[PDB]
Amino acid sequence: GVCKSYKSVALVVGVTGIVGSSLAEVLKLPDTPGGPWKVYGVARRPCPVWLAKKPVEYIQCDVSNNQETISKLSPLKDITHIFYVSWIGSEDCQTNATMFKNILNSVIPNASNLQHVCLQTGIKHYFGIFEEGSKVVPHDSPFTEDLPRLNVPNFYHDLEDILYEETGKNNLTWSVHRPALVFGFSPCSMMNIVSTLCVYATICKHENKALVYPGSKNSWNCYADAVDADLVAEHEIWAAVDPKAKNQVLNCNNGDVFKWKHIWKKLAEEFGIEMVGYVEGKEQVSLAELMKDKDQVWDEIVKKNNLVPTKLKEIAAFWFADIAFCSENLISSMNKSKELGFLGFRNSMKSFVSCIDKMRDYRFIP
Amino acid sequence: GVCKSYKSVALVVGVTGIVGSSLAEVLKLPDTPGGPWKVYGVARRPCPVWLAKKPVEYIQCDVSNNQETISKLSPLKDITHIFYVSWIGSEDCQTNATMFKNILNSVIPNASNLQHVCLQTGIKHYFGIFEEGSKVVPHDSPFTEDLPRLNVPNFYHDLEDILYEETGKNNLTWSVHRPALVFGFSPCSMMNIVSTLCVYATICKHENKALVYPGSKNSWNCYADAVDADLVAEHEIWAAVDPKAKNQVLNCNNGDVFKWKHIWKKLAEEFGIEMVGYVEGKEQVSLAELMKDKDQVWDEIVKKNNLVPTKLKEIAAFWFADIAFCSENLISSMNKSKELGFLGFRNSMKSFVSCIDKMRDYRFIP
């Protein structure tokens, strides 16, 4: 059979991630802008079974290693768009920078039809980094894309600088996407809040305990926002294909606000267990501490429910929930994207439930 | 010349109001859905000069008087859509009810091509009434259209009940629109926040004083939302013409959030004066009290700047600003409208400035 024709050819760097996994789905839909798409999906681990069941050409590669990346990506002469949706899982500026440089150095000399590089960062651009030593004054919100860089060693700054330099030199377009908190389904993410809260809820249910909210008062009652992984995918694809979005920094959220108070009630209902909400006068407790000895319990759950086998620390990031539940005042604006013609949105309450439903369909959670 | 053809014929009840004045503009644009529109505009006062310069057939009528309303509206046999965007200016349930009943009793028997009645209420549906005696527990937010009625004598309840009964009996469709705080330009409104704050700012400037924020701490820092009058008009016209919107209760806001803190800075810049923002530890002061003796000052301003002559209490509602500046937790959801296909929005910061610009173009403010 003659070689298959594609209109566009994506390199998704971080294909097992919370957005990369969505891109692997969304890019292959028949009506997706820029389609038909061929998808190369890059990650460090062996292709998981769930991803092997998708029409994605998986490339196992440690992108922090330059010679390996050259060897693995330089043969991919047909790439048209790069979606960089990866990070090393620490805030180390140079390791993260090296990963992104390696992608560009390996692809740009070899992909003569390369058009665009999508760089995914996030709303930490506006408020700072997670490293405990960093005592920094964030910007006030709503966050908009005209806010200047904070005086902090945020690896996002280095990634942008590389993006601008390398696209500029090579007559490529660029986009920087700054998603809010992601609502997604990947069990291989280092920061999946829905999966994390679903695992907590599952363990509570397993142990005949209530779904006890461990967070701060402020994070219970404040306005919060998030972004569905599929909407991030759609926003990145929009910037990759639509001339109006090119060479722009762009926030990405669902377009609404919610409260954790309301999400919590929904979570309890979804698992058919009692909730204990925020109790007046109580201080936040560490969910990471509450769950520190639960690995064997999770193993037992996986076995009893015949789930996709996951290690507790890989499917859940309890430390990340702890940060979410002592955060407030982090709302980001979608006006710039809307004014440029991107009218994609989600109902965040419905998005949260859709992620639960999807994780159950995939057998990641009971 | 042969009688002019129109596709649709609007009765706008409250044509001098903050939304009615926008409808008088929007309905007459060439690309407005349902057009070409003929517009009958009803209000109690004599047609102001600014409205006489619009292609609107003005009908001076006190709609609280049944015989007068019959006499004035029963000849209008060609009405296709009613936009009820009026209230008496008190919370008296029966006077407000009487006004709306009178419209329907006068039009329904006489307009054989009548299709739809749009009823404008508002987000007070979710939190209660302004009357000082009423000590009531509001719903929590974000406000959605599935929230049940509060146990309060809100005239909105009576207006809805009349709408349902009379449309139901007569095979007409209905829509209830619940706008957030309106950003608009009418100088004849009983509740125009932008005009009110512009008048304050103008007086501050006239007296070489700073723009001193008089509100509460909470209302300075909280998330707030609003709706541009033109977007309310567009939302009402959408419900009047689009089958998907028919027989629905629908919120209407700009689709974003803002803070008064940020609006205040913008207001000061627009008037080229210094601002004093919220001062930590200060209690809210009454802007109504601050402005109680300023009528002659406003007269002098009107004369010195050659403005459209307005009485201070008619262009500004300082009591209404006082309520805005002790409110929080009033965000409403636009998901229902979006899910039904209405994707109209405004950038609220830009909307606020556009209202200032428009009021200056009309010579209502300097």
Ligand SMILES: NC(=O)c1ccc[n+]([C@@H]2O[C@H](COP(=O)([O-])OP(=O)(O)OC[C@H]3O[C@@H](n4cnc5c(N)ncnc54)[C@H](OP(=O)(O)O)[C@@H]3O)[C@@H](O)[C@H]2O)c1
């Ligand atoms: N998650 C959120 O809620 C969120 C919100 C806003 C912004 N963001 C930002 O979005 C960006 C991407 O993060 P994410 O959360 O989408 O990531 P994630 O879900 O944790 O996924 C990371 C991906 O990168 C891959 N990866 C990591 N190190 C690699 C290496 N050395 N070589 C090759 N692949 C490697 C991972 O595969 P392996 O496991 O095989 O290494 C995985 O596919 C980050 O800047 C993050 O801060 C995230």
Ligand SMILES: NC(=O)c1ccc[n+]([C@@H]2O[C@H](COP(=O)([O-])OP(=O)(O)OC[C@H]3O[C@@H](n4cnc5c(N)ncnc54)[C@H](OP(=O)(O)O)[C@@H]3O)[C@@H](O)[C@H]2O)c1
């Ligand atoms: N303003 C806001 O920010 C806001 C926000 C959300 C919801 N709403 C709601 O929207 C609804 C309409 O209020 P609005 O603020 O748009 O009104 P508005 O700007 O004060 O305008 C009221 C209109 O009704 C007319 N009117 C009053 N009494 C009348 C009578 N007896 N006969 C005939 N016309 C009469 C007025 O004309 P005359 O002066 O000549 O009488 C004027 O045209 C109310 O339920 C209000 O609570 C308002």
Ligand SMILES: CC(C)=CCC/C(C)=C/C(=O)O
């Ligand atoms: C409330 C929380 C936990 C926000 C952080 C979202 C992320 C992960 C942003 C980013 O990585 O830029």
Ligand SMILES: CC(C)=CCC/C(C)=C/C(=O)O
């Ligand atoms: C923050 C304020 C002042 C909200 C009231 C908006 C209005 C006027 C609602 C309604 O009339 O339903």
